[PDB]
């Protein structure tokens, strides 16, 4: 198709941001469940 200069044109490595954002969600979804345990503290929290 074309040329692989994603790094040549810019050494920002923005592409990496896609690998961290794609894997990060994996962990976040894990807290969605554990959060249930914290949802209780909401009813009564020590301010």
Swiss-Prot record:
It is found in: Cell membrane. The keyword Cell membrane applies. GO terms for cellular component: plasma membrane. It comes from the Archaea. Belongs to the archaeal-ATPase H subunit family. Purified ATP synthase is 25.9 nm long. The hydrophilic A1 domain is 9.4 X 11.5 nm, the central stalk is 8.0 X 3.9 nm and the membrane-bound A0 domain is 6.4 X 10.6 nm; the domains are connected by two stalks. ATP is synthesized or hydrolyzed by the A1 domain while ion translocation occurs via the A0 domain. Component of the A-type ATP synthase that produces ATP from ADP in the presence of a proton gradient across the membrane. This is A-type ATP synthase subunit H. Keywords: ATP synthesis, Cell membrane, Coiled coil, Hydrogen ion transport, Ion transport, Membrane, Transport. Forms a boomerang-shaped homodimer with arms about 12.0 and 6.8 nm in length with 89% helical content. The N-terminus contacts subunit E. The C-terminus contacts subunit A. The A-type ATPase is composed of subunits A(3), B(3), C, D, E(1 or 2), F, H(2), I and K(x).
